[PDB]
Amino acid sequence: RDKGAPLNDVAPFGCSIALEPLRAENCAVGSIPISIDIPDAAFTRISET
Amino acid sequence: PTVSDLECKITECTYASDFGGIATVAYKSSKAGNCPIHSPSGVAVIKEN
Numbered sequence A: 001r002d003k004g005a006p007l008n009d010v011a012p013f014g015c016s017i018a019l020e021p022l023r024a025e026n027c028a029v030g031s032i033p034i035s036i037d038i039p040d041a042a043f044t045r046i047s048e049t
Numbered sequence B: 001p002t003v004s005d006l007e008c009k010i011t012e013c014t015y016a017s018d019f020g021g022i023a024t025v026a027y028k029s030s031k032a033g034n035c036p037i038h039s040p041s042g043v044a045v046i047k048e049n
Helices: none
Strands: A016-018 A023-025 B004-012 B022-028
Touching: none
Parallel strands: none
Antiparallel strands: A016 A023, B004 B022
């Protein structure tokens, strides 16, 4: 009854805290480091022409 | 053959490799022909001739 601000409900990223291993679902939290393998097919043929 | 306006652009390379170098030579010919590709080096060879 001391629910006046559970972290789920004040999650400042809009995280839907879900239970069992515990997880914070669908946040707006952080910025995500991504190392991305770009496909060579999405550049030009062999030359900027 | 007639060769004019020759440029070498290296697109990608594997450092000091067997034939891991990939480069493109863009050009202009006044009369199309077959020209020998070459490097007079002995520490570098062009795969094709």
